[PDB]
Amino acid sequence: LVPRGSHMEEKMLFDFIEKDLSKSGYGIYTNYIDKSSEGDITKGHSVLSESEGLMMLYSVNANNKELFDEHFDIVKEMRLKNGLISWRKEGDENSPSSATIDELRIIKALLLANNRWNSFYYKFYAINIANSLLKHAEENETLVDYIDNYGKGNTTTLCYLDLPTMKLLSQVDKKWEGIYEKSNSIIENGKISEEVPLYRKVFYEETQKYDEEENVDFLLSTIVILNRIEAGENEESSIKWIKEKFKKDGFLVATYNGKNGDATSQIESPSIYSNVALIANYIGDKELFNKAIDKLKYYQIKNKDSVLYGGFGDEKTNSVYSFDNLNALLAFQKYKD
Ligand SMILES: [Mg+2]
Ligand SMILES: [Mg+2]
């Protein structure tokens, strides 16, 4: 009953990300190794604003203003002439393109930071980004995924529709209510089936229709589900489906058949388990939460002699993805034992 080694997993994982996947003043690397042997992967030590946005969310949750500011300073330098944050940098070069989901994740961290630390600067900077999203990515109240200096795409991935950020934005300015309402309508009209109450992957603004994939991308649906509930919307049937599936298979994998709900992949991911844990945390489901956390504990590299100690990835090849590690850090942050 006296806690022993509380927050150990979080510490180990933060230590790995800070010492082994980061460079001071530069940011969080996308992969542990910049170039794989044989050259298949080549930009491992680029920095994604995805990674930075995740670390900012973690910092505000951790009430760590110093760490928050250190990653926000890197993001400010990734800002492009259109007001959006670049998707990626390599050394000193920013990519001229942006993804809506990264912009919205950063706006969310900034608005949370303003609420937490009473610092208007974060809020004003978030507004600049948000106004640029409206100017550059919006079409009939729908935000499209992709934006560069020449124009924008015409597809909307449902996991990009960050309802919680749009809700926060609506509290600052009413123009965001229409965006929230359209986004939520896209989500609500995109259920896969009654048997498998997960979500479509993409919405096509031109036809107002969804993809027709037979398989559900599970990670993406967990993102949509987490977004829905944090914004106060209803996900009772989807969460039941996840809880039943996790209970019956004993694991969750990358894809399921949209008709009958059978696993169609053998691949597990720390990002899937992270999201399931964040969902369970949010709704107060302790059993689901522990089940998801147990998977993350199991896959975390526990070997003190591995350079990957504390992290997630393949010990044999030193293959590591920042995205899985950062999502795991967010889940372990909720784990109090
Ligand atoms: Mg422990
Ligand atoms: Mg280390």
Side-chain angles (χ1 to χ4, degrees), residues 49 53 56 68 72 74-80 82-87 97-111 120-138 143-144 147 162 165-166 169 172 175-176 179:
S49 56
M56 289 166 69
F68 184 101
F72 183 36
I74 289 151
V75 161
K76 294 203 282 179
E77 298 310 308
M78 295 178 71
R79 194 186 58 196
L80 297 168
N82 64 7
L84 294 183
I85 311 311
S86 178
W87 89 287
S97 72
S98 291
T100 291
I101 188 180
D102 302 328
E103 314 301 325
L104 288 165
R105 190 184 294 102
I106 288 167
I107 284 144
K108 184 187 198 191
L110 287 167
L111 297 176
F120 75 91
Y121 187 89
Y122 300 135
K123 182 185 165 180
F124 280 22
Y125 203 99
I127 287 156
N128 288 337
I129 316 304
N131 285 335
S132 298
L133 269 177
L134 287 174
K135 180 179 300 180
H136 297 300
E138 183 268 350
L143 304 191
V144 305
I147 311 92
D162 192 339
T165 302
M166 294 163 185
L169 282 166
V172 182
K175 55 192 166 166
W176 282 92
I179 303 286

Side-chain angles (χ1 to χ4, degrees), residues 12 15-17 19-20 32 306-310:
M12 286 169 55
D15 283 353
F16 170 69
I17 292 154
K19 303 167 181 188
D20 302 300
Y32 176 69
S306 185
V307 302
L308 308 180
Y309 175 72

Side-chain angles (χ1 to χ4, degrees), residues 1-4 6 337:
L1 292 152
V2 165
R4 286 170 185 279
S6 284
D337 306 326

